[PDB]
Amino acid sequence: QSEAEKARKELLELEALSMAVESTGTAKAEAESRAEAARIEGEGSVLQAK
Amino acid sequence: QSEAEKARKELLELEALSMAVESTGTAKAEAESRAEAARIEGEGSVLQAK
C-alpha cells in the first residue's frame, strides 16, 4: 500500500491540473458571454440615444 | 488511470473552446437581434415625429 500510494499521488496531482481546466474554462465561458452581450447593448444604446 | 487522465485533460480543454462557442454565439445572436429591431424603430420614430 506504500507502493499503491506513491503512484496514487501522481494520479491525484494530474486530476488537479484537469480540474483546473473544467473550472476555469467553465467560468471563463459564462462570463465572456455576458460581457459580449452587454457590449452590443452598450454600443446600441449610444446610437439609440442619438 | 494516470494514463486515462493525461488524455482526459485534453478532452476537457477542447470542451472549453467548444463551450465558449455555444455561449458567446448564443448571446451574440439574441443581442444583435434586439439592436437591429430597435434601430428600425429609432429611424422610423424620427420620420414619424416629422
Side-chain angles (χ1 to χ4, degrees):
Chain A
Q1 297 180 358
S2 66
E3 292 293 325
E5 183 72 28
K6 284 181 280 188
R8 186 182 293 116
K9 185 179 78 170
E10 299 296 326
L11 176 60
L12 289 176
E13 70 188 8
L14 291 180
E15 293 178 355
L17 294 177
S18 175
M19 187 174 70
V21 174
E22 186 177 3
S23 296
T24 190
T26 304
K28 176 175 182 290
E30 187 180 1
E32 285 185 352
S33 68
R34 290 189 184 94
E36 186 67 25
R39 183 187 60 80
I40 306 300
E41 298 176 354
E43 292 176 353
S45 293
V46 178
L47 180 64
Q48 293 176 358
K50 188 181 291 292
Chain B
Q1 297 180 358
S2 66
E3 292 293 325
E5 183 72 28
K6 284 181 280 188
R8 186 182 293 116
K9 185 179 78 170
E10 299 296 326
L11 176 60
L12 289 176
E13 70 188 8
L14 291 180
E15 293 178 355
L17 294 177
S18 175
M19 187 174 70
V21 174
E22 186 177 3
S23 296
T24 190
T26 304
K28 176 175 182 290
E30 187 180 1
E32 285 185 352
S33 68
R34 290 189 184 94
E36 186 67 25
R39 183 187 60 80
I40 306 300
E41 298 176 354
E43 292 176 353
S45 293
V46 178
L47 180 64
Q48 293 176 358
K50 188 181 291 292

Coordinates of all heavy atoms in Angstrom, one line a residue:
Chain A
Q1 N 0.8 -1.2 0.0 CA 0.0 0.0 0.0 C 0.9 1.3 0.0 O 0.4 2.3 -0.3 CB -0.9 0.0 1.2 CG -1.9 -1.2 1.1 CD -2.8 -1.2 2.3 OE1 -2.7 -0.4 3.2 NE2 -3.7 -2.2 2.3
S2 N 2.1 1.1 0.4 CA 3.0 2.2 0.2 C 3.4 2.4 -1.3 O 3.7 3.5 -1.8 CB 4.3 2.0 1.0 OG 5.0 0.9 0.5
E3 N 3.3 1.3 -2.1 CA 3.6 1.3 -3.5 C 2.3 1.8 -4.3 O 2.5 2.6 -5.2 CB 4.0 0.0 -4.0 CG 5.4 -0.4 -3.5 CD 6.5 0.5 -4.0 OE1 6.3 0.9 -5.2 OE2 7.4 0.8 -3.3
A4 N 1.2 1.4 -3.8 CA -0.1 1.8 -4.4 C -0.5 3.2 -3.9 O -1.7 3.6 -3.9 CB -1.2 0.8 -4.2
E5 N 0.5 3.9 -3.3 CA 0.2 5.3 -2.8 C 1.2 6.3 -3.4 O 0.9 7.4 -3.6 CB 0.3 5.3 -1.3 CG 0.0 6.6 -0.7 CD -1.5 7.0 -0.8 OE1 -2.3 6.0 -0.8 OE2 -1.8 8.2 -0.8
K6 N 2.4 5.8 -3.7 CA 3.3 6.7 -4.4 C 2.9 7.0 -5.8 O 3.1 8.1 -6.4 CB 4.8 6.1 -4.4 CG 5.4 6.2 -3.1 CD 6.8 5.7 -3.1 CE 6.8 4.2 -3.0 NZ 8.2 3.6 -2.8
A7 N 2.2 6.0 -6.5 CA 1.6 6.3 -7.8 C 0.3 7.0 -7.6 O 0.0 7.9 -8.4 CB 1.4 4.9 -8.5
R8 N -0.5 6.7 -6.6 CA -1.8 7.4 -6.4 C -1.6 8.9 -6.1 O -2.5 9.7 -6.3 CB -2.6 6.7 -5.3 CG -4.0 7.3 -5.2 CD -4.8 6.7 -4.1 NE -5.1 5.3 -4.3 CZ -4.7 4.3 -3.6 NH1 -3.9 4.5 -2.5 NH2 -5.0 3.0 -3.9
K9 N -0.4 9.3 -5.6 CA -0.1 10.7 -5.5 C 0.0 11.3 -6.9 O -0.3 12.5 -7.1 CB 1.1 11.0 -4.7 CG 1.3 12.5 -4.5 CD 2.5 12.9 -3.7 CE 3.8 12.8 -4.6 NZ 4.9 13.4 -3.9
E10 N 0.5 10.5 -7.9 CA 0.6 11.0 -9.2 C -0.7 11.1 -9.9 O -1.0 12.1 -10.6 CB 1.6 10.1 -10.0 CG 3.0 10.1 -9.4 CD 3.7 11.4 -9.5 OE1 3.4 12.2 -10.4 OE2 4.4 11.7 -8.6
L11 N -1.6 10.1 -9.7 CA -3.0 10.2 -10.2 C -3.7 11.4 -9.7 O -4.5 12.0 -10.3 CB -3.7 9.0 -9.9 CG -5.2 9.0 -10.3 CD1 -5.4 9.2 -11.8 CD2 -5.9 7.7 -9.9
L12 N -3.3 11.8 -8.4 CA -4.0 12.9 -7.8 C -3.6 14.3 -8.3 O -4.4 15.2 -8.4 CB -3.9 12.9 -6.3 CG -4.6 11.7 -5.6 CD1 -4.3 11.7 -4.1 CD2 -6.1 11.9 -5.8
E13 N -2.3 14.4 -8.6 CA -1.8 15.8 -9.0 C -2.2 16.0 -10.5 O -2.2 17.2 -10.9 CB -0.4 15.9 -8.7 CG 0.6 15.2 -9.5 CD 2.0 15.3 -9.0 OE1 2.2 15.8 -7.9 OE2 3.0 14.8 -9.7
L14 N -2.4 14.9 -11.2 CA -2.9 15.1 -12.6 C -4.4 15.5 -12.6 O -4.8 16.2 -13.5 CB -2.7 13.9 -13.4 CG -1.2 13.6 -13.8 CD1 -1.2 12.3 -14.6 CD2 -0.5 14.7 -14.5
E15 N -5.1 15.0 -11.6 CA -6.5 15.4 -11.5 C -6.7 16.8 -11.1 O -7.7 17.4 -11.2 CB -7.3 14.5 -10.5 CG -7.4 13.1 -11.0 CD -8.1 12.2 -10.0 OE1 -8.4 12.7 -8.9 OE2 -8.4 11.0 -10.3
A16 N -5.6 17.4 -10.5 CA -5.6 18.8 -10.1 C -5.4 19.7 -11.3 O -5.9 20.8 -11.3 CB -4.6 19.0 -9.0
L17 N -4.6 19.3 -12.2 CA -4.5 20.0 -13.5 C -5.8 20.0 -14.3 O -6.3 21.0 -14.8 CB -3.3 19.5 -14.3 CG -1.9 19.8 -13.7 CD1 -0.9 19.1 -14.6 CD2 -1.7 21.2 -13.5
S18 N -6.3 18.8 -14.3 CA -7.6 18.5 -15.1 C -8.7 19.3 -14.5 O -9.6 19.9 -15.2 CB -7.9 17.1 -15.1 OG -9.1 16.8 -15.8
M19 N -8.8 19.3 -13.1 CA -10.0 20.0 -12.5 C -9.8 21.5 -12.6 O -10.8 22.3 -12.6 CB -10.1 19.6 -11.1 CG -11.4 20.1 -10.4 SD -11.6 19.4 -8.8 CE -10.3 20.2 -7.9
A20 N -8.6 22.0 -12.7 CA -8.4 23.4 -13.1 C -9.1 23.7 -14.4 O -9.8 24.8 -14.5 CB -6.9 23.7 -13.2
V21 N -8.9 22.9 -15.4 CA -9.5 23.2 -16.7 C -11.0 23.2 -16.7 O -11.6 24.1 -17.2 CB -9.0 22.1 -17.7 CG1 -9.7 22.3 -19.1 CG2 -7.5 22.2 -17.9
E22 N -11.6 22.2 -16.1 CA -13.1 22.1 -16.1 C -13.7 23.3 -15.4 O -14.8 23.7 -15.6 CB -13.5 20.8 -15.4 CG -15.0 20.6 -15.5 CD -15.4 19.3 -14.9 OE1 -14.5 18.6 -14.4 OE2 -16.6 18.9 -14.9
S23 N -12.9 24.0 -14.5 CA -13.5 25.1 -13.7 C -13.1 26.4 -14.3 O -14.0 27.3 -14.4 CB -13.0 25.0 -12.2 OG -13.5 23.8 -11.7
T24 N -11.9 26.7 -14.6 CA -11.5 27.9 -15.2 C -12.1 28.1 -16.6 O -12.4 29.2 -17.0 CB -10.0 28.1 -15.2 OG1 -9.7 29.5 -15.6 CG2 -9.4 27.2 -16.2
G25 N -12.3 27.0 -17.3 CA -12.9 27.1 -18.6 C -14.4 27.3 -18.6 O -14.9 28.0 -19.4
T26 N -15.0 26.7 -17.6 CA -16.5 26.9 -17.5 C -16.8 28.4 -17.0 O -17.7 29.0 -17.5 CB -17.1 26.0 -16.5 OG1 -16.8 24.6 -16.8 CG2 -18.6 26.1 -16.4
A27 N -16.0 28.9 -16.1 CA -16.3 30.2 -15.6 C -15.9 31.3 -16.6 O -16.5 32.4 -16.7 CB -15.7 30.5 -14.2
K28 N -14.8 31.0 -17.3 CA -14.4 31.9 -18.4 C -15.4 32.0 -19.5 O -15.6 33.0 -20.1 CB -13.0 31.4 -18.9 CG -12.5 32.2 -20.1 CD -11.1 31.7 -20.5 CE -10.5 32.5 -21.6 NZ -11.2 32.2 -22.9
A29 N -16.1 30.9 -19.7 CA -17.1 30.9 -20.8 C -18.3 31.6 -20.5 O -18.9 32.4 -21.3 CB -17.4 29.4 -21.2
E30 N -18.9 31.4 -19.3 CA -20.1 32.1 -18.9 C -20.0 33.5 -18.7 O -20.9 34.3 -18.7 CB -20.7 31.3 -17.7 CG -22.1 31.8 -17.3 CD -22.6 31.0 -16.1 OE1 -21.9 30.2 -15.6 OE2 -23.8 31.3 -15.7
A31 N -18.7 34.0 -18.4 CA -18.5 35.4 -18.1 C -18.2 36.2 -19.4 O -18.6 37.4 -19.5 CB -17.4 35.6 -17.1
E32 N -17.5 35.6 -20.3 CA -17.2 36.3 -21.6 C -18.5 36.4 -22.4 O -18.6 37.3 -23.3 CB -16.1 35.6 -22.3 CG -14.7 35.8 -21.7 CD -13.7 35.2 -22.6 OE1 -14.0 34.5 -23.6 OE2 -12.5 35.5 -22.3
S33 N -19.4 35.5 -22.3 CA -20.7 35.6 -23.0 C -21.5 36.8 -22.5 O -22.0 37.6 -23.3 CB -21.5 34.3 -22.8 OG -21.9 34.2 -21.5
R34 N -21.5 37.0 -21.2 CA -22.2 38.2 -20.6 C -21.6 39.5 -21.0 O -22.2 40.5 -21.1 CB -22.4 38.0 -19.1 CG -23.3 36.9 -18.7 CD -23.6 37.0 -17.2 NE -24.4 35.9 -16.8 CZ -23.9 34.8 -16.3 NH1 -22.6 34.6 -16.1 NH2 -24.8 33.8 -15.9
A35 N -20.2 39.5 -21.1 CA -19.5 40.7 -21.5 C -19.8 41.1 -22.9 O -19.8 42.3 -23.2 CB -18.0 40.5 -21.2
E36 N -20.0 40.1 -23.8 CA -20.2 40.4 -25.2 C -21.6 40.9 -25.5 O -21.8 41.9 -26.2 CB -19.9 39.2 -26.0 CG -20.0 39.4 -27.5 CD -18.9 40.3 -28.0 OE1 -17.8 40.4 -27.3 OE2 -19.0 41.0 -29.0
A37 N -22.6 40.3 -24.8 CA -24.0 40.7 -25.0 C -24.1 42.2 -24.4 O -24.9 43.0 -25.0 CB -24.9 39.8 -24.2
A38 N -23.4 42.5 -23.3 CA -23.6 43.8 -22.7 C -22.8 44.8 -23.5 O -23.1 46.0 -23.4 CB -23.1 43.8 -21.3
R39 N -21.9 44.4 -24.4 CA -21.2 45.4 -25.3 C -22.1 45.7 -26.4 O -22.1 46.9 -26.9 CB -19.9 44.8 -25.8 CG -19.1 45.8 -26.6 CD -17.9 45.1 -27.2 NE -18.3 44.0 -28.0 CZ -18.8 44.1 -29.3 NH1 -18.9 45.3 -29.8 NH2 -19.1 43.0 -30.0
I40 N -22.8 44.7 -27.0 CA -23.8 45.0 -28.0 C -24.9 46.0 -27.6 O -25.2 46.9 -28.2 CB -24.4 43.7 -28.6 CG1 -23.3 42.7 -29.0 CG2 -25.3 44.0 -29.8 CD1 -22.4 43.3 -30.0
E41 N -25.4 45.7 -26.4 CA -26.4 46.6 -25.8 C -25.8 48.0 -25.6 O -26.5 49.0 -25.7 CB -26.9 46.1 -24.5 CG -27.6 44.7 -24.6 CD -28.0 44.1 -23.3 OE1 -27.7 44.7 -22.2 OE2 -28.7 43.1 -23.3
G42 N -24.5 48.1 -25.2 CA -23.9 49.3 -24.9 C -23.5 50.2 -26.1 O -23.6 51.4 -26.1
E43 N -23.2 49.5 -27.2 CA -22.9 50.3 -28.5 C -24.2 50.7 -29.1 O -24.3 51.7 -29.8 CB -22.1 49.4 -29.4 CG -20.7 49.3 -28.9 CD -19.8 48.4 -29.8 OE1 -20.4 47.8 -30.8 OE2 -18.6 48.2 -29.6
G44 N -25.3 49.8 -29.0 CA -26.6 50.2 -29.5 C -27.2 51.4 -28.7 O -27.9 52.2 -29.3
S45 N -27.0 51.4 -27.4 CA -27.6 52.4 -26.6 C -27.1 53.8 -27.0 O -27.8 54.8 -26.9 CB -27.4 52.1 -25.1 OG -28.1 51.0 -24.7
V46 N -25.8 53.9 -27.4 CA -25.3 55.2 -27.8 C -26.0 55.6 -29.1 O -26.4 56.8 -29.2 CB -23.8 55.0 -28.1 CG1 -23.2 56.4 -28.6 CG2 -23.1 54.6 -26.8
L47 N -26.2 54.7 -30.0 CA -27.0 55.0 -31.2 C -28.5 55.3 -30.9 O -29.0 56.3 -31.3 CB -26.9 53.9 -32.3 CG -27.6 54.2 -33.6 CD1 -27.1 55.4 -34.3 CD2 -27.6 52.9 -34.5
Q48 N -29.1 54.4 -30.2 CA -30.5 54.5 -29.8 C -30.7 55.9 -29.1 O -31.7 56.5 -29.3 CB -30.9 53.4 -28.9 CG -30.9 52.1 -29.6 CD -31.3 50.9 -28.6 OE1 -31.4 51.2 -27.4 NE2 -31.4 49.7 -29.2
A49 N -29.8 56.3 -28.2 CA -29.9 57.6 -27.6 C -29.6 58.7 -28.5 O -29.8 59.9 -28.1 CB -29.0 57.6 -26.3
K50 N -29.0 58.4 -29.7 CA -28.7 59.5 -30.6 C -29.9 59.8 -31.5 O -30.3 61.0 -31.7 CB -27.5 59.1 -31.5 CG -27.0 60.2 -32.3 CD -25.8 59.7 -33.2 CE -24.6 59.4 -32.3 NZ -24.0 60.7 -31.7
Chain B
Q1 N -4.9 4.7 -14.7 CA -5.8 5.9 -14.5 C -5.0 7.2 -14.6 O -5.6 8.2 -14.9 CB -6.5 5.8 -13.2 CG -7.4 4.6 -13.2 CD -8.2 4.5 -11.9 OE1 -8.0 5.3 -11.0 NE2 -9.0 3.4 -11.8
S2 N -3.7 7.1 -14.5 CA -2.9 8.3 -14.8 C -2.8 8.5 -16.3 O -2.6 9.6 -16.7 CB -1.5 8.1 -14.2 OG -0.8 7.0 -14.8
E3 N -2.9 7.4 -17.0 CA -2.9 7.5 -18.5 C -4.2 7.9 -19.0 O -4.3 8.7 -20.0 CB -2.4 6.2 -19.1 CG -1.0 5.9 -18.8 CD -0.1 6.8 -19.5 OE1 -0.4 7.3 -20.6 OE2 1.0 7.2 -18.9
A4 N -5.3 7.4 -18.5 CA -6.6 7.8 -18.9 C -7.0 9.1 -18.2 O -8.2 9.5 -18.1 CB -7.6 6.7 -18.5
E5 N -6.0 9.9 -17.8 CA -6.3 11.2 -17.2 C -5.4 12.3 -17.9 O -5.8 13.4 -18.0 CB -5.9 11.2 -15.7 CG -6.2 12.5 -15.0 CD -7.7 12.8 -14.9 OE1 -8.5 11.8 -14.8 OE2 -8.1 14.0 -14.8
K6 N -4.2 11.9 -18.4 CA -3.5 12.9 -19.2 C -4.2 13.2 -20.5 O -4.0 14.3 -21.1 CB -2.1 12.4 -19.4 CG -1.2 12.5 -18.2 CD 0.2 12.0 -18.4 CE 0.3 10.5 -18.4 NZ 1.7 10.0 -18.4
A7 N -4.9 12.2 -21.1 CA -5.7 12.4 -22.2 C -7.0 13.1 -21.9 O -7.5 14.0 -22.6 CB -5.9 11.1 -23.0
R8 N -7.6 12.8 -20.7 CA -8.9 13.4 -20.4 C -8.7 14.8 -20.1 O -9.7 15.6 -20.1 CB -9.5 12.6 -19.2 CG -10.9 13.1 -18.9 CD -11.5 12.4 -17.6 NE -11.7 11.0 -17.9 CZ -11.2 10.0 -17.2 NH1 -10.3 10.3 -16.3 NH2 -11.5 8.7 -17.5
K9 N -7.5 15.3 -19.8 CA -7.3 16.7 -19.7 C -7.4 17.4 -21.0 O -7.8 18.5 -21.1 CB -5.9 17.1 -19.0 CG -5.8 18.6 -18.8 CD -4.5 19.0 -18.2 CE -3.4 19.0 -19.2 NZ -2.2 19.6 -18.7
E10 N -7.0 16.6 -22.1 CA -7.1 17.2 -23.4 C -8.5 17.2 -23.9 O -9.0 18.2 -24.5 CB -6.2 16.3 -24.4 CG -4.8 16.3 -24.0 CD -4.2 17.7 -24.1 OE1 -4.6 18.5 -25.0 OE2 -3.3 18.0 -23.3
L11 N -9.3 16.2 -23.6 CA -10.7 16.2 -23.9 C -11.4 17.4 -23.2 O -12.4 17.9 -23.7 CB -11.4 14.9 -23.5 CG -12.9 14.8 -23.7 CD1 -13.3 15.1 -25.1 CD2 -13.5 13.5 -23.2
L12 N -10.9 17.7 -22.0 CA -11.6 18.8 -21.2 C -11.3 20.2 -21.7 O -12.1 21.1 -21.7 CB -11.2 18.7 -19.7 CG -11.8 17.5 -19.0 CD1 -11.2 17.5 -17.6 CD2 -13.3 17.6 -18.9
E13 N -10.0 20.4 -22.2 CA -9.7 21.8 -22.6 C -10.3 22.0 -24.0 O -10.4 23.2 -24.4 CB -8.2 22.0 -22.6 CG -7.4 21.3 -23.6 CD -5.9 21.5 -23.2 OE1 -5.6 22.0 -22.2 OE2 -5.0 21.1 -24.1
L14 N -10.6 21.0 -24.8 CA -11.3 21.2 -26.1 C -12.8 21.4 -25.8 O -13.4 22.2 -26.6 CB -11.1 20.0 -27.0 CG -9.7 19.7 -27.5 CD1 -9.7 18.5 -28.4 CD2 -9.2 20.9 -28.3
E15 N -13.3 20.9 -24.8 CA -14.7 21.2 -24.4 C -14.8 22.6 -23.9 O -15.9 23.2 -23.9 CB -15.3 20.2 -23.4 CG -15.4 18.8 -23.9 CD -15.9 17.9 -22.8 OE1 -16.0 18.3 -21.7 OE2 -16.1 16.7 -23.1
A16 N -13.7 23.2 -23.5 CA -13.8 24.6 -23.1 C -13.8 25.6 -24.2 O -14.3 26.7 -24.1 CB -12.6 24.9 -22.1
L17 N -13.1 25.2 -25.3 CA -13.2 26.0 -26.5 C -14.6 25.9 -27.1 O -15.2 26.9 -27.6 CB -12.1 25.6 -27.5 CG -10.7 25.9 -27.1 CD1 -9.7 25.3 -28.2 CD2 -10.5 27.3 -26.9
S18 N -15.1 24.7 -27.1 CA -16.4 24.4 -27.7 C -17.5 25.1 -26.9 O -18.5 25.6 -27.5 CB -16.7 22.9 -27.8 OG -18.0 22.6 -28.2
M19 N -17.4 25.1 -25.6 CA -18.5 25.7 -24.8 C -18.4 27.2 -24.9 O -19.4 27.9 -24.7 CB -18.4 25.2 -23.3 CG -19.6 25.6 -22.5 SD -19.5 24.9 -20.8 CE -18.1 25.7 -20.1
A20 N -17.2 27.7 -25.1 CA -17.1 29.2 -25.5 C -18.0 29.5 -26.6 O -18.8 30.5 -26.6 CB -15.7 29.5 -25.8
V21 N -18.0 28.7 -27.7 CA -18.8 28.9 -28.9 C -20.3 28.9 -28.6 O -21.0 29.8 -29.0 CB -18.4 28.0 -30.0 CG1 -19.3 28.1 -31.2 CG2 -16.9 28.2 -30.4
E22 N -20.7 27.8 -28.0 CA -22.2 27.7 -27.8 C -22.7 28.9 -26.9 O -23.9 29.1 -27.0 CB -22.5 26.4 -27.1 CG -23.9 26.1 -26.9 CD -24.2 24.7 -26.3 OE1 -23.2 24.0 -26.0 OE2 -25.4 24.3 -26.2
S23 N -21.9 29.5 -26.1 CA -22.4 30.6 -25.2 C -22.2 32.0 -25.8 O -23.1 32.8 -25.8 CB -21.7 30.5 -23.9 OG -22.0 29.2 -23.3
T24 N -21.0 32.3 -26.3 CA -20.8 33.6 -26.9 C -21.6 33.7 -28.2 O -22.0 34.8 -28.5 CB -19.3 33.9 -27.2 OG1 -19.1 35.2 -27.5 CG2 -18.8 33.0 -28.3
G25 N -21.8 32.6 -28.9 CA -22.6 32.7 -30.1 C -24.1 32.9 -29.8 O -24.8 33.6 -30.6
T26 N -24.6 32.2 -28.8 CA -26.0 32.4 -28.4 C -26.3 33.8 -27.9 O -27.3 34.4 -28.3 CB -26.4 31.3 -27.4 OG1 -26.0 30.0 -27.9 CG2 -27.8 31.4 -27.1
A27 N -25.4 34.3 -27.1 CA -25.7 35.6 -26.5 C -25.4 36.7 -27.5 O -26.1 37.8 -27.5 CB -24.9 35.9 -25.3
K28 N -24.5 36.5 -28.4 CA -24.2 37.5 -29.5 C -25.4 37.5 -30.5 O -25.7 38.6 -31.0 CB -23.0 37.1 -30.3 CG -22.7 37.9 -31.5 CD -21.4 37.5 -32.1 CE -21.0 38.4 -33.3 NZ -21.9 38.1 -34.4
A29 N -26.1 36.4 -30.6 CA -27.2 36.4 -31.6 C -28.5 37.0 -31.0 O -29.2 37.8 -31.8 CB -27.5 34.9 -31.9
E30 N -28.8 36.8 -29.8 CA -30.1 37.3 -29.2 C -29.9 38.8 -28.9 O -30.9 39.5 -28.8 CB -30.4 36.6 -27.9 CG -31.7 36.9 -27.3 CD -32.0 36.1 -26.1 OE1 -31.2 35.3 -25.7 OE2 -33.1 36.3 -25.5
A31 N -28.7 39.3 -28.8 CA -28.5 40.7 -28.5 C -28.4 41.6 -29.8 O -28.8 42.7 -29.8 CB -27.2 40.9 -27.6
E32 N -27.8 41.0 -30.8 CA -27.8 41.8 -32.1 C -29.1 41.8 -32.8 O -29.4 42.7 -33.6 CB -26.7 41.2 -33.0 CG -25.3 41.5 -32.7 CD -24.3 41.0 -33.7 OE1 -24.8 40.2 -34.6 OE2 -23.1 41.3 -33.6
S33 N -30.0 40.9 -32.5 CA -31.3 41.0 -33.0 C -32.1 42.1 -32.4 O -32.8 42.9 -33.0 CB -32.1 39.6 -32.8 OG -32.3 39.4 -31.4
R34 N -32.0 42.3 -31.0 CA -32.7 43.4 -30.4 C -32.1 44.7 -30.8 O -32.8 45.7 -30.7 CB -32.6 43.2 -28.9 CG -33.4 42.0 -28.3 CD -33.4 42.1 -26.8 NE -34.1 40.9 -26.3 CZ -33.5 39.8 -25.9 NH1 -32.2 39.7 -26.0 NH2 -34.2 38.8 -25.4
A35 N -30.8 44.8 -31.1 CA -30.2 46.1 -31.5 C -30.7 46.5 -32.9 O -30.8 47.7 -33.2 CB -28.7 46.0 -31.5
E36 N -31.0 45.5 -33.7 CA -31.5 45.8 -35.1 C -32.9 46.3 -35.1 O -33.3 47.2 -35.8 CB -31.2 44.6 -36.0 CG -31.5 44.9 -37.5 CD -30.5 45.9 -38.1 OE1 -29.4 46.0 -37.5 OE2 -30.9 46.5 -39.1
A37 N -33.8 45.6 -34.4 CA -35.2 46.0 -34.3 C -35.3 47.4 -33.7 O -36.2 48.2 -34.1 CB -35.9 45.0 -33.5
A38 N -34.5 47.7 -32.7 CA -34.6 49.0 -32.1 C -34.0 50.1 -32.9 O -34.3 51.3 -32.7 CB -33.9 49.0 -30.7
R39 N -33.1 49.7 -33.9 CA -32.7 50.7 -34.9 C -33.7 51.1 -35.9 O -33.9 52.2 -36.3 CB -31.4 50.3 -35.6 CG -30.8 51.3 -36.5 CD -29.7 50.7 -37.3 NE -30.2 49.6 -38.1 CZ -30.8 49.7 -39.2 NH1 -31.1 50.9 -39.7 NH2 -31.2 48.6 -39.9
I40 N -34.5 50.1 -36.3 CA -35.6 50.3 -37.2 C -36.7 51.2 -36.6 O -37.1 52.2 -37.1 CB -36.2 49.0 -37.7 CG1 -35.2 48.1 -38.3 CG2 -37.3 49.3 -38.7 CD1 -34.4 48.7 -39.5
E41 N -37.0 50.9 -35.3 CA -37.9 51.7 -34.6 C -37.4 53.1 -34.4 O -38.1 54.1 -34.4 CB -38.2 51.1 -33.2 CG -38.9 49.8 -33.3 CD -39.1 49.1 -31.9 OE1 -38.6 49.7 -30.9 OE2 -39.7 48.0 -31.9
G42 N -36.0 53.3 -34.3 CA -35.4 54.6 -34.0 C -35.3 55.4 -35.2 O -35.5 56.7 -35.1
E43 N -35.1 54.8 -36.4 CA -35.1 55.6 -37.6 C -36.5 56.0 -38.0 O -36.7 57.0 -38.7 CB -34.3 54.9 -38.7 CG -32.9 54.7 -38.4 CD -32.2 53.9 -39.5 OE1 -32.8 53.3 -40.3 OE2 -30.9 53.9 -39.4
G44 N -37.5 55.1 -37.7 CA -38.8 55.4 -38.1 C -39.4 56.5 -37.2 O -40.2 57.3 -37.6
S45 N -39.0 56.5 -35.9 CA -39.5 57.5 -35.0 C -39.1 58.9 -35.4 O -39.9 59.8 -35.1 CB -39.1 57.2 -33.6 OG -39.6 56.0 -33.1
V46 N -38.0 59.0 -36.0 CA -37.6 60.4 -36.5 C -38.5 60.8 -37.6 O -38.9 62.0 -37.6 CB -36.1 60.3 -36.9 CG1 -35.7 61.7 -37.4 CG2 -35.2 59.9 -35.7
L47 N -38.8 59.9 -38.5 CA -39.7 60.3 -39.6 C -41.2 60.4 -39.0 O -41.8 61.4 -39.3 CB -39.7 59.2 -40.7 CG -40.7 59.4 -41.8 CD1 -40.3 60.7 -42.6 CD2 -40.7 58.2 -42.7
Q48 N -41.6 59.5 -38.2 CA -42.9 59.5 -37.6 C -43.1 60.8 -36.9 O -44.2 61.4 -36.9 CB -43.2 58.3 -36.7 CG -43.2 57.0 -37.4 CD -43.4 55.9 -36.5 OE1 -43.4 56.0 -35.3 NE2 -43.5 54.7 -37.0
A49 N -42.1 61.3 -36.1 CA -42.2 62.5 -35.4 C -42.0 63.7 -36.4 O -42.3 64.9 -35.9 CB -41.1 62.6 -34.3
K50 N -41.7 63.5 -37.6 CA -41.6 64.6 -38.5 C -42.9 64.9 -39.2 O -43.3 66.0 -39.3 CB -40.5 64.3 -39.6 CG -40.1 65.4 -40.5 CD -39.1 65.0 -41.5 CE -37.7 64.8 -40.8 NZ -37.1 66.0 -40.3

